[PDB]
Amino acid sequence: EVSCDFYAWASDSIACTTSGRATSFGSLQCQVKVRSREGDPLAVYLKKGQEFTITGQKRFEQTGFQSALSGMYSPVTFSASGASLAEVHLFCLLACDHDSCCDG
C-alpha cells in the first residue's frame, strides 16, 4: 500500500557537501535524512528548486528580476559537470537560511 510521508523545510534534514576548491568549487552532492528504516521499498522525491515560485525556510520568491546594483557578497562559482542547476539552487537556499544577514 502507498504510505507517503512528507518532510518539510526548516527540518534541517537537507545538507550539501562541496568537492574541490572567488571560491570556485568543483562538485556538489546533496544529502537528505529520512525517518525510514533503511528498508528496501522506499523512494525519495526532492523538490527541484528554480521550478516553484516560493521555496525555502524563509519563503524566498522568484522575483523575476535578473540583476541588482549592490549587495553581492561571498560569490561562489561551481563548475559544470559536478553540480546541477537544482543542486546549486539548493546550496544557496540552505546557505541563506542560516545567515540572518542574507536577504536573497
Side-chain angles (χ1 to χ4, degrees), residues 1-11 13-20 22-28 30-35 37 39 41-104:
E1 165 67 20
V2 179
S3 307
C4 187
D5 269 358
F6 307 91
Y7 292 165
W9 312 107
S11 280
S13 306
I14 298 170
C16 287
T17 311
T18 62
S19 302
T23 73
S24 164
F25 292 164
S27 290
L28 187 145
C30 65
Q31 284 96 23
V32 307
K33 298 169 59 180
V34 194
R35 79 182 183 184
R37 283 304 292 177
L42 188 153
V44 186
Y45 292 103
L46 175 69
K47 267 184 162 177
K48 291 211 291 189
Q50 62 84 30
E51 300 285 325
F52 308 93
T53 303
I54 297 169
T55 61
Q57 187 177 339
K58 295 192 303 195
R59 295 173 39 94
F60 301 105
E61 286 205 11
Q62 208 164 269
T63 64
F65 277 97
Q66 319 196 291
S67 171
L69 294 175
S70 295
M72 190 167 351
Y73 64 93
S74 72
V76 178
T77 183
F78 295 80
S79 291
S81 181
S84 177
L85 187 56
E87 286 159 335
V88 177
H89 173 283
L90 183 63
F91 172 67
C92 319
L93 185 145
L94 293 180
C96 187
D97 282 333
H98 301 109
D99 201 0
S100 304
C101 183
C102 174
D103 302 298

